[PDB]
Amino acid sequence: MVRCMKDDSKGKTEEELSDLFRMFDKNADGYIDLEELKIMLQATGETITEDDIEELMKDGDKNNDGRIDYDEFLEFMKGVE
Ligand SMILES: [Ca+2]
Numbered sequence: 001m002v003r004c005m006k007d008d009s010k011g012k013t014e015e016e017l018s019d020l021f022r023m024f025d026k027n028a029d030g031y032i033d034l035e036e037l038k039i040m041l042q043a044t045g046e047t048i049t050e051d052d053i054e055e056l057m058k059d060g061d062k063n064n065d066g067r068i069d070y071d072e073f074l075e076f077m078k079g080v081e
């Protein structure tokens with residue numbers, strides 16, 4: 001039958017991935033760049049270099065536009081290896 005609260009629909013769809021994108025973003029505009037990503041990366045303990053970040057954007061970018069967005073993230077996260 002039909003429920004009220006409906007706590008069965010617990011499927012990890014793209015709806016949940018949309019949040020992961022905002023985490024990486026700095027100002028939450030919808031796109032990510034080496035400069036922006038370099039900021040969030042600074043929080044990490046290890047000392048990453050500007051060159052090391054280029055690798056993250058290289059494989060992270062699928063539209064060869066230079067930045068990463070929801071469409072790119074959903075594609076990058078949906079099977080990185
Ligand atoms: Ca952004």
Ligand SMILES: [Ca+2]
Pocket residue numbers: 061062063064065066067068069072
């Ligand atoms: Ca792209």
